[PDB]
Design a protein around this nucleic acid. Structure first.
Lengths: 48, 220
DNA sequence: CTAGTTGATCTCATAAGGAGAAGGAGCAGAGCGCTTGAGC
């Protein structure tokens, strides 16, 4: 995807931004979900 | 109906121990009119009895006609036991020995206080420190009673409370015998008997007599 | 100590930003002393 980078993100960091321009979550899976695809897409549906 | 008698009864009602013997027992001019039917004369008796030096009528701020009464001797005896041991205890004693027995006006002018009583412009803060000189305006100030804050807060709270329940009462009437018989509400602590006298004087209720005692109603 | 004089000194006179922080509004509900108030 697209993630803010560079001077804009550096400013966004120095002045705490209550509303990040591109907020994101890096989600890692625990069980079979991490290996197989059906369960992982299921978790995606559960989260989106 | 004697104003000397009238003021005495109210004095007895006062919850003396409730205020830890610090505030002198205040009685209102509103409840004075309750005992004495002819108000026209009640002011006249208290007027000469003011300059007679046996009463102090202090102006309060809960309404425009707020005039409280403090016993002179008790007003004296209580200020020393409150002022002494404090930085302001200095010239308040002078105020007592000079101003009180030489004047009876409810508010003192700037030129009056400074010249007639020989007061400087530095010690005047000490009287403002603990309820001795209020603030009427730039030029004048009403006489204060120390520790009057708590009283009026409970007094105003009580007046509202009694008024509210009277209105709530079915058909908007409530027999006077039904106040004394019923336990006083905990919201008002100055005494249910104390307040019912106040609305009578304030004419928020009328003492309507009937076969079943006397009744109070909101004005129509 | 007293007048007289000399300057100072004054007075009066005629005409196609933003991000954030701070205040206040309005509604929304919880709680509670109260005032009944009526079923067993």
């Amino acid at each position: 995807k697209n993630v803010t980078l560079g001077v804009p993100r550096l400013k966004e960091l120095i002045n705490i931004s209550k509303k990040p321009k591109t907020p994101s979550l890096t989600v890692f899976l625990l069980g079979q979900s991490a290996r197989d695809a059906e369960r992982a897409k299921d978790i995606l549906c559960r989260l989106e | 109906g004697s104003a000397r008698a009238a003021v005495s009864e109210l004095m007895q009602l006062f919850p003396r121990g409730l205020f830890e013997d610090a505030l002198p027992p205040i009685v209102l001019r509103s409840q004075v009119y309750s005992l004495v039917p002819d108000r026209t004369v009640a002011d006249r008796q208290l007027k000469e009895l003011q300059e007679q030096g046996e009463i102090r009528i202090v102006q309060l701020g809960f309404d425009l006609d707020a005039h409280g009464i403090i016993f002179t001797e008790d007003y004296r005896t209580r200020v020393l036991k409150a002022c002494d041991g404090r930085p302001y205890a200095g010239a308040v004693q002078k105020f007592l020995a000079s101003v009180l027995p030489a004047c009876g006006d409810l508010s003192f002018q700037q030129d009056q206080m400074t010249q007639t009583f020989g007061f400087r412009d530095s010690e005047i803060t000490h009287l403002v420190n603990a309820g001795v000189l209020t603030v009427r305006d730039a030029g004048s100030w009403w006489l204060a009673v120390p520790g009057a804050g708590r009283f009026i807060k409970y007094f105003v709270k009580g007046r509202q409370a009694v008024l509210s329940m009277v209105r709530k009462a079915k058909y908007r009437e409530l027999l006077l015998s039904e106040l004394l018989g019923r336990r006083a509400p905990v919201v008002v602590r100055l005494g249910l008997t104390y307040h019912v006298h106040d609305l009578i004087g304030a004419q928020l209720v009328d003492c309507i007599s009937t076969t079943s005692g006397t009744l109070l109603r909101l004005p129509e």
